[PDB]
């Protein structure tokens, strides 16, 4: 029954800082980090970083490496980021997510993914006056047939491993992982996502495409430079509906 609940929006002039957390409550699991992922309005994921609070060793994404710091108070199951320094381009939607370790017959094992998200945290920066993984824009079909999502990446991303993930999101709510390790769907997710990669392109296929199914997509993955990226994102209209 694990969530995470973070703080409320903040609005911010060029060159201060924020700071927001990230609450975790409802379960008992410990074997996890927490990951921090922002999206500009009308634009895609970027990964920014992550801590495993068992350590407290955090680790960022070059971009925002000297001006983000992610920490965590276990006391409190609590975790932050502060970007500091803030600009036009960080006006975005942040989100924390749980980056788990979970457990089967080989033990403790990273599924490379986000599994659960918080409900984002907008950031405005008042006006002042001024991708490894690439995905098609958008793809527009009818209901009832099977359409397949690309995602091309490079050789130390999509190419590299397995760690390569699918994540839907609609209006107003945090992405959902529908698949993990190439082709895994998590419990409850549907079976008419399926996974698969050849090279450097990950693909998803919806079967059977439901109204429902109308979304943006956007595929991620784990790098060779320990971190993560994700797509530029498609977004998927089912026609008639
Ligand atoms: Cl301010
Ligand atoms: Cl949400
Ligand atoms: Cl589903």
């Known amino acids: 029954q694990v969530q995470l609940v973070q703080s409320g929006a903040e609005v911010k002039k060029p060159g201060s800082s924020v700071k927001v957390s990230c609450k975790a409550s409802?379960?008992?699991?410990?074997?996890?980090?927490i990951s921090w992922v922002r999206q500009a309005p009308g634009q895609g994921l970027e990964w920014m970083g992550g801590?495993?609070?068992?350590?407290?060793?955090?680790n960022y994404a070059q971009k925002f490496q000297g001006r983000v710091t992610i920490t965590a108070d276990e006391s409190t199951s609590t975790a932050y980021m502060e970007l500091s320094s803030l600009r036009s381009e960080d006006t975005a939607v942040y989100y924390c997510?749980?980056?788990?370790?979970?457990?089967?017959?080989?033990?403790?094992?990273?599924?490379?993914?986000?599994?659960?998200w918080g409900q984002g945290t907008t950031v405005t920066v008042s006006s002042g006056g001024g991708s490894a993984l690439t995905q098609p824009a958008s793809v527009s079909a009818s209901p009832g047939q099977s359409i397949t999502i690309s995602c091309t990446g490079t050789?130390?991303?999509?190419?590299?491993?397995?760690?390569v993930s699918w994540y839907q999101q609609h209006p107003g709510k945090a992405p959902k992982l529908l698949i993990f390790?190439?082709?895994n769907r998590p419990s409850g997710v549907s079976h008419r996502f399926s996974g698969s990669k050849s090279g450097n392109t990950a693909s998803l296929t919806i079967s059977g495409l439901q109204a429902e199914d109308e979304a943006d997509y956007y595929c991620?993955?784990?790098?060779?430079?320990?971190?993560?990226?994700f797509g530029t994102g498609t977004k998927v209209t089912v026609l008639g509906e």
């Open positions: 801590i495993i609070p068992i350590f407290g060793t955090a």
């Open positions: 409802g379960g008992t699991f410990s074997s996890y980090a």
């Open positions: 390790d190439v082709n």
């Open positions: 997510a749980r980056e788990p370790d979970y457990y089967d017959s080989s033990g403790y094992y990273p599924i490379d993914a986000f599994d659960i």
């Open positions: 050789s130390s991303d999509v190419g590299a491993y397995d760690w």
């Open positions: 991620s993955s784990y790098t060779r430079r320990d971190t993560y990226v």
